[PDB]
Symmetry: D3
Subunit: 149 residues, 6 copies
């Protein structure tokens, strides 16, 4: 219920003008915006973030693509926000993503797939700690909370 | 082909500002608005409406939640409007609801799931009769009818 | 602040599928929905409602047009809802209506201008009393009230 | 990656005002508009286009429906545009079509299902050649190409 | 009600993905789509089209910009479609264009102002004749005509 | 045309779910997102920011309202972004704001007017320096730059 997930709008997402469109979907869904910042990620940050993919054939090109422009880093709160957030994003490969999902509606190739979401609560807490100082995560009550829960 | 279903935007749906957004989806889909009204439902109306759920652990809290604010009661007409309407709403639990559906796009918890739709033609006719007098259901021809149905 | 206006989506507005679109604009603006109903208006109701236009050349045709299909009658509440509501509708003649307004965005000819709004607080209270029984007007507090006022 | 599909907005789609709405979905997805034209299709064109359905009970009525008003014929380019285009359209019967898809969002009956897409690369090249002269298909580079691929 | 205007989405408009968005505004307004085509315009066509601006300092660069990519050429029909179309586009300089208008919502600099509309009925008929063969302009009745015009 | 302006989404704007909607308008207009962050502003920051309004009757209540929840602070770049940004916001009092503008579309009372924009280039550079460290302002080229200018 106070669960948190880390959502990152990739450089292609920013370049193609989907920041507002993506944020809008999390807002209208009911989730609470906890953190938000706009930054060019360093390669050391990206390598730690994508560490499970370290020895994959695409990993070099992934780190380059993600360093190439700025990203919108975000933190969203709510019941099953990690799982439901992943569903809203759609499948990691946009080829598999359904219409209605962010990737399904807005992108084509896996190498340029506009958005990242945390795969689990464990990954979420690691990625949140990695991308944000705790001082940057804002605590407040949504005025619509009693109508969402 | 002029089958009818009952749709009710719950109090959280009204409070969160989704009335127009929800109605828009039925309009752009092609279905015809037959009835529409804004009312605070009494507990006797809600208890009859949700009578199949009478002896469920949540039933007391459901009736309270639904009494707490006003609802937009509606009646929509068209081919398989009951079944297709249910699909557009998405799964009753928003956790299962797909993006693209009303619940999937706009709500999180099952207890605050913004909208009701009739589960069958049998339930639809019972719920329509329950929520509307027959005088309130307007009959007219959509100007786009020949481009929606053959 | 507890001021009310009467808004009515004309038959062409209902026929062309603008009910949700119109309602959405009042919702997102911040105004509170007080009353809403869907009815075929009788000629005696329409003649009383448009009584100031009784002896105009179009009046007969206006009353027929408004009787021809159903209308969505509404009541909205908020600070200067009558004046601001009129602004959102745009000029009565759509030829004069600005893009951004309901008539400006959605209709062309004055004879088929999709929506009515009350011109003043006086007209509003007369039109509300005329179209609604007092039992049909619902009283409640918006959860966003402290962020609107 | 330079694959093309043929997309036709049927007469009901044009009549109901979905041309912009449909085109918008292909644009925001990332696909490149290659060809676009507005024409009343002849019965010989329609009979050749729907030749695989020649001896079906609905075929006469299909050809009539498609001749009844104008259509927006289109050609779109991109990676798996034929397959993904089909997915975006949704199932041919709107009864089966999912919310989020064009047919799922915008139509009800199979006989009036607003849009056609090519079922395969083979059908696409036949349908493109059938509906367009090669001079009408415009070649250019999307400014967002490096962020789509 | 049978008046026609020539609307054209410039190359920047096509490149930035506003074709559907622009067309949508004319559709939802009530105007009838009469002609539509996607073409790279030749310099002789553009020079004839912008002939009143022939001896302006920007004219060379205008013709180049308009030749650089494809355009969506269109023809729309309805009551005061030329005047109202111009209003919907907004002021030619986007700096002056109001929010709600196409240029006001979607572009910044006058040199890249995404759309053209005919300034008058006279210009409209010249521009329509210039950009379209008469066989390409489709005639039909909108199913919503009786709800748009009396 | 490398002007920057400071735009801030007030607490009511965040609470009512307009962050994506507001950002979308700047994106689709053509302006480049330079900085973005989500923070609860301190009273010393707000008092310095609204220093020209220091001795106004509402100033105490303004500072309280702006401290009450978090804000989305932003920096946008482009030709006349300060002036055009102000136009897109609409008049400071929503009563005067036109439909089509952010305040005109989304809010009612001056005390809860959802968004701030810089009034001039001078104020913009002061407000940017005040709300952002220079390290937080990201520099990059829009892929659509040659089609915007
Ligand atoms: S995002 O969080 O989805 O980031 C991301 C991770 C992994 C992939 C990927 C790729 C791939 C292919 C071509 C080029 C790439 O980067 C330039 C990446 N292939 C498979 N996966 C999914 C996995 C695991 C893309 C994006
Ligand atoms: S709506 O028409 O879906 O109304 C509604 C009916 C049933 C449920 C429900 C619940 C549930 C859980 C927690 C709290 C509740 O109300 C306060 C209700 N659990 C399962 N269902 C679906 C069934 C059967 C919610 C809403
Ligand atoms: S609604 O409130 O817009 O109702 C309404 C009132 C008055 C007019 C109108 C007409 C006119 C012209 C042609 C046909 C008509 O009805 C069939 C009406 N001419 C001027 N006005 C504006 C005024 C006062 C239309 C609609
Ligand atoms: S479009 O490409 O969707 O065109 C189209 C092709 C086939 C069908 C169709 C029909 C059907 C039913 C009733 C009336 C019709 O036309 C007037 C067509 N039944 C099945 N299919 C799909 C197949 C195979 C509809 C539209
Ligand atoms: S379109 O119809 O908007 O075509 C068009 C005509 C005139 C202008 C224009 C310019 C200008 C400035 C810099 C560069 C240009 O083209 C590359 C054009 N300056 C004033 N106007 C408006 C007039 C008259 C732009 C576009
Ligand atoms: S923002 O930049 O829009 O901040 C802002 C500044 C000033 C006003 C304002 C007020 C006013 C009235 C009642 C309550 C207030 O704050 C709680 C503020 N009265 C006039 N202005 C216009 C100016 C400047 C509102 C918002």
């Amino acid at each position: 219920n106070c669960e948190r997930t880390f959502i990152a709008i990739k450089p292609d997402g920013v370049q193609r003008g989907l920041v507002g469109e993506i944020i809008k979907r999390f807002e209208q869904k009911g989730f609470r915006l906890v953190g938000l910042k706009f930054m060019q990620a360093s390669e050391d940050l990206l390598k730690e973030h994508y560490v499970d993919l370290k020895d994959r054939p695409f990993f070099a090109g992934l780190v380059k693509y993600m360093h190439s422009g700025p990203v919108v880093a975000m933190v969203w709160e709510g019941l099953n926000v990690v799982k439901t957030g992943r569903v809203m994003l759609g499948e990691t490969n946009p080829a598999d993503s359904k219409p209605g999902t962010i990737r399904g509606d807005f992108c084509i190739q896996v190498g340029r797939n506009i958005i990242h979401g945390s795969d689990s609560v464990e990954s979420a807490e690691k990625e949140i700690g990695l991308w944000f100082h705790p001082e940057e995560l804002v605590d407040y009550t949504s005025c619509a909370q009693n109508w969402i829960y």
